[PDB]
Amino acid sequence: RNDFYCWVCHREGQVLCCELCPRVYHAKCLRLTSEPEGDWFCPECEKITVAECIETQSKAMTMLTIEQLSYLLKFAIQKMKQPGTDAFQKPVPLEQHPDYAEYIFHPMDLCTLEKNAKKKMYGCTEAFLADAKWILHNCIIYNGGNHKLTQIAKVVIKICEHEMNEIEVCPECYLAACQKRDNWFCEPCSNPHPLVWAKLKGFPFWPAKALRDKDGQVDARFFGQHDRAWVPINNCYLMSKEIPFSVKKTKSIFNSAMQEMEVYVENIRRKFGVFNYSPFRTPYTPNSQYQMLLDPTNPSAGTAKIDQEKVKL
Ligand SMILES: [Zn+2]
Ligand SMILES: [Zn+2]
Ligand SMILES: [Zn+2]
């Protein structure tokens, strides 16, 4: 049953209908080349389609069954359900809001979202976020964009977006960080993240995992603190024995980071049999293979084939 309120701006008016879902849109809100002719699927349905196509699913999704994704969405829900989100934890009751269904054609709340996830209804992170966004749309429609509840619903969505992004960067990292087992940061992932010296401007060189490469920036997760930052690629070296010296305020904190990295290297050598340190100041390059080479003096031989286990995660 189609919505009356634009998915983008949350206002009524003349609105286009999606063929696949009940969302509607002002044409003007979509900034189109021209209005659609007939077969039209909205930006949410389009995203979901691209994300759920096996050939073009993310690295994260290729890693994961629908049931494994559902486990991770359960962790995301628990972050969304934090103290102060009470108003959104259960369906809106008609007792308190007798006219709710006159405005809100697709109710949603955190308990429904959680149940849906447990039932394996979501095929990708995009689909989970698209559904959670009904909570904010509905809040704005019914209560108004400047209502205090809208602040809360906005934070719930920003949390969801954050958690979905983390799943997509690396589902194995995400699960490890969620469960916080003993030395969780020292567990190598199935396609292990290269270790780098990473220098954020104004910060000392520090050991990190390189999680992804986007246009000249590296997404680095630092040993010790386990914080993150985009780092310019030319400020990232492959891990080496020789340390790029920086003046630092606390030696003990840097020591704890190096110790953690040492355990990680022991663990990767156990898991894959290899870890190659680089000559000092060797530039990190995207999708770096160096550390996983069987013979680092013979890069054409690549990484060793030992493998055909189903439980890769
Ligand atoms: Zn609009
Ligand atoms: Zn749609
Ligand atoms: Zn990972």
Residue numbers in the entry: 86 to 392, 394 to 399
Which text from the study accompanies this structure?
To better understand how multivalent interactions involving more than two reader domains impact recognition of PTMs, affecting protein function, we studied the topology of the N-terminal triple reader domain architecture found in the zinc-finger MYND domain-containing protein 8 (ZMYND8), which contains, in addition to a PHD/BRD arrangement, a Pro-Trp-Trp-Pro (PWWP) domain within a PHD/BRD/PWWP cassette. Here, we resolve the crystal structure of the triple reader module (PHD-BRD-PWWP) of ZMYND8, which forms a stable unit capable of simultaneously recognizing multiple histone PTMs while presenting a charged platform for association with DNA.
ZMYND8 contains the conserved asparagine responsible for Kac peptide docking onto BRD modules (Filippakopoulos et al., 2012), a feature missing in the ZMYND11 BRD, which, instead, contains a tyrosine residue and was not found to recognize Kac (Wang et al., 2014, Wen et al., 2014). The distribution of charge on the surface of the ZMYND8 structure revealed highly charged patches as well as a large hydrophobic area on the back of the PWWP domain. A C-terminal extension necessary for expression of the three protein modules packed onto this hydrophobic area of the PWWP domain, inserting bulky hydrophobic residues (F360, Y362, F365, and Y369) into pockets formed on the PWWP surface. The interactions of the C-terminal extension with the PWWP domain explain the necessity for its presence, conferring stability to the triple reader modules. Intriguingly, the C-terminal tail of a crystallographic neighbor was found to be inserted into the cavity of the PWWP cage. Superimposition of the mouse ZMYND11/histone 3 trimethyl lysine 36 (H3K36me3) complex established that the C-terminal tail residue K396 of ZMYND8 mimics H3K36me3 insertion within the cage, suggesting that ZMYND8 may be able to bind to unmodified lysine residues.
